[PDB]
Every structure is written in C-alpha cells, then in structure tokens.
Amino acid sequence: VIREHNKWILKKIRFQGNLNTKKMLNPGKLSEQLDREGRKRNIYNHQIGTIMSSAGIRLEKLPIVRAQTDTKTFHEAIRDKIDKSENRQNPELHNKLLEIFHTIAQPTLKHTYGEVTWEQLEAGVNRKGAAGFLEKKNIGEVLDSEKHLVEQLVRDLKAGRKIKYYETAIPKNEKRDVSDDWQAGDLVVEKRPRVIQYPEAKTRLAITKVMYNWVKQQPVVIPGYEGKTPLFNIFDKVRKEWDSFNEPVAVSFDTKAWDTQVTSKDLQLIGEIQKYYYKKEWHKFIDTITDHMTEVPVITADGEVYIRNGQRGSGQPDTSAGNSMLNVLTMMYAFCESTGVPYKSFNRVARIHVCGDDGFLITEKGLGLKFANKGMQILHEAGKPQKITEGEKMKVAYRFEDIEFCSHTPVPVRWSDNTSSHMAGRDTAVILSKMATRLDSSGERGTTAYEKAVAFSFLLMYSWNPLVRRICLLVLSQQPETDPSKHATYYYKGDPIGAYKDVIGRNLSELKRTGFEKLANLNLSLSTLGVWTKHTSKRIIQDCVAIGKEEGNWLVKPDRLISSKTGHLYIPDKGFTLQGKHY
C-alpha cells in the first residue's frame, strides 16, 4: 500500500526482499550492488542469472553467503582453529611413516629433481598473487622488477644463510556454501572466514622455483594424488578399482581442520621425502625452509603478530603435495595399524585416493569396516583427529555410487550406443549457486563473452544435469558472433558442442540417460530449500524448444529431449577446448 510516485522503484526489484522488516515495507531487492569502492556492479552473472529467473529459480534462495571478513570475527577464527598446541603423536609414528614411504618411493626419480627455469615457473602463475605485508610488490610485479632478488634468495636458501621468514594471515573473501546449514533450520546469513596464512610473494617464487617438481607434482609421485586429473573421467577409473574387489567398500577420510593439525615432525617427514627426490645440491635449501616452517611468525592483516607452532599455512607452496603425501602416509599407516595388513601389502588389499586432506580408500568389506572402527582412535593418536559424527566410526560406503570425493560423487550416464560411464556430480542447488555467483575477479565486471565461457565450462563438468545443461546451452546460444572469454575455467575454440566431444570424447547429443536415483538425490535441495518451482523444468525446456524449432542448426538441439521436441538435430563443427583460470 505505498504511494504512486513511488511505484517506479518496484519495476526494478528483481528478488524478494531480505530485511525482515516488521513495520516498514521491504518490496524486494535489486540486481545491482555497491562495490567496496563506490562502484555499482552486478551481484550475479546477468545472462545466466536472467535465464535462471525465467523459470521459477529464486537466486535469492541459493545456499550461498559471503564470508565474514571483519577483524572481530577474523580474529575469532584464528583463536578458534589456529591457536592450539602441537598435537601429541605416538612415538615411533614418523619412523613407520617413512618406512611406508619407501614402499611407495619411485627410485627412477630418486635424487633427480632440481631447480627449474623462470619460464616453466611462470606457467599460468597467479600474477595477482597476494604480496606480503612488509612487502610492496606482488607476484608478477615481482617477476618484472625484483626477479633478480628472488634469485639471490634461492641462492641464499641454498647456501642456507639467514632469512626473515614470516607469514601473513588474512580472512578469505569468498562466497560460501550453507547448503547443509539452511537445509536444516539454521538459516545463517554469513559464515566464518577461512584464514589464509601465506609466505611473501618473493619467497613463494624462490620456493616454487626450485621445488616446482614436488610442489606442482609434475611427475605425480603421491599414491592416489588425484588433483591433477580432470573431474570428468575420474570416477571412471575409480569405478574400475571398485569392480575389482569381491564385496567392495569405501572408507572416507575426515580429519578435523587438517592444516591446524600438521605437526612439526610431520613437516620434517615431508622434508625427508623431499630430499629423497631432490639432487643433493638442494638438501640444505629444503632443510633450511623446513626449519623455518616449524615455528612461523605470522602478521595478521590488522597488524597483530603471533608465533605459530608449525601447522600448514594454506598459502605455503608445498601445501597441496605436502598435505596429500602426508595424508596418504598417515591413512595407509592407519589402515595397516587397524587391520593387521603388513605395510608392503597395502596396494594388494586396498586402493587409496587422495586430494589434499580429502580422500578415501577402497577395500573388501571386512578389512574396510575394521579400518572404520579401530580407525578413529589410531588416527587420533597419530595427530590427525577425525570429526565426531554419531556412529563413532569412519564413514563407510557400501555402494560405489555413494563414494564422496573432492566434493563430488559419481553420476550414472548411459550413452547412445548403450554404453555407460560416470561423471562428476554435486547438488544442483550448488552447481547453480556457483554458476550465478562466479564472476571474473581475474578481471572486473561482466560480458556475455565471459558468461559464454562460464556456461561452456559448466557444460564440460555437468552435462549430466539436464537443468544445468539446457541453461548452459541457452547461454551459449547467445551472441554466436562473439568468441568466449579466456578468463573462465575452460573456454572453447571453434564450435562448443564440438569441443565437448574433443574432451568428453563423446557427443553431447549422445548423452542418453542420467541415473534417475542419483539425480533425484542431487535435486532435493532445489525443492527443500525452495530454490525452484514445479514449472521451472517445463519453463526452461520450452525456452529451448522455442529457439530450437526454427529452421536451422541450433546448438540447443544437443539436448536429446529438446531435439526431439523441436524436430531438429544439431550438426557440430569445429571445437577445441582450452584452459583459462582453472586450479
């Protein structure tokens, strides 16, 4: 019941309001927002978002929220997770971890690794890499001017001279999932931030420059390290392994705040394993840097200074390999300690998959459930505590289809030629949540050029999800007269629908059927959290049908369902997939 001269604003409201105002009209919310520096930008990706809004998709209900980046809570964070004594660990642990290491060392590479060229280092590096605190220039900026400085540092570290290592701590500015939360009463509006602690831009360069091989895992030498493999065919290889066992089972790793749990001795162990693969001319370097990481001086963004007793500073270059290697060793060790399986017999009774602290292992029911029970406690005294759940034991998968890994589970996908396979799945709500909120930060603002790349990228990753697929298509369907932006995860050269072939190996038009069950499960939060309406499915479909009925080769015909309905198929052309900003 507002006044007339004031109803013009109403035609600008795009979403339901969220002020919860009890005695003042809250008409809704707009699609623009005030940038941290006065600017007025979009909140979402306009194109993708507009289409989502065409159907009953309330972008507002997406389980996503900004992270509290304010000093008061940032400090709470550091106090809550980081402020802790080093974990006590059974004595001999590290001997046995080393022992286990030797059962998985690749002699063909022992003492072969050394420094690498500036050229291979700068391989799509993140020039916008943070800069330090006491440091002026950032990565890239450092490449250009102070390069030679990096060199003397390397040289300094090698000589093992004195250095002023310290790490900067800052809350991470990112939108986060609250899908689990909202799914349950708790309708949080923001979430604690991840606190990043990281080495100086120059130091990061020196480090990654000589340890490129171990850090980037060029020559993956970590058993089960799967963060080098593309998420579209990963569950396929795991599928194999699963089928090889009689009555398989997957046990999931679930350590609490892993980084905060890394011991000093854990760090030294990695030091050893690193010296195992590096030419002797670098062992002092390795020892030197490792001696520093056992007690790091951290300077918070606000100015505070705390002396952290060894843990993993997410920003350390070695984090990925470091945590992955240390994680597999500990879990293997844990498995053995639990079942009775001798160390060298690991690879014969089980298969392990890891990605940083995340990971699981496949094995015969018996051995797996054993690992699952005695596991918690063994792990607990190993210094890597597992999250208390309810059935006081590790999560056990009895169905391959239930394996959770790297934030995904497998998704069944039948192809035209009745052949099958598995794609990487996730909650649609979340796919949508990332689709509408990912903008190019490695840039600023938005263009259909960008969204097109975004759509393409999600096509490669989620073609099994109809909703998403048709939305991606509708996106790609626009401005064909313009090539994609290279600021996305991926991007195509030539014809998109082609490239999907170029990478997936098959044709989109061939995606005949997606597991019904896996899909019903992956669509729950959509209803439960009120993200979509009943009509949404139909709504988006017609949206395609419309474009795709006119005479022509419509790239929206690859949906076997839309194609059917339009009476037109799409005839692909060129198309070769590339990369852009993918980690």
Swiss-Prot record:
Reaction equations catalysed: RNA(n) + a ribonucleoside 5'-triphosphate = RNA(n+1) + diphosphate
Top-level taxon: Viruses
Name of the protein in question: RNA-directed RNA polymerase
Glycosylation sites recorded in the entry for this protein: 418, 507, 523
Residues binding GTP, per UniProt: 229, 231, 426, 434
Function text: Replicates the viral (+) and (-) genome. Initiates the primer-independent RNA replication via a de novo mechanism requiring GTP.
Annotated RdRp catalytic domain residues: 248-371
Shown segment, full-protein numbering: 3361 to 3943 of 3988
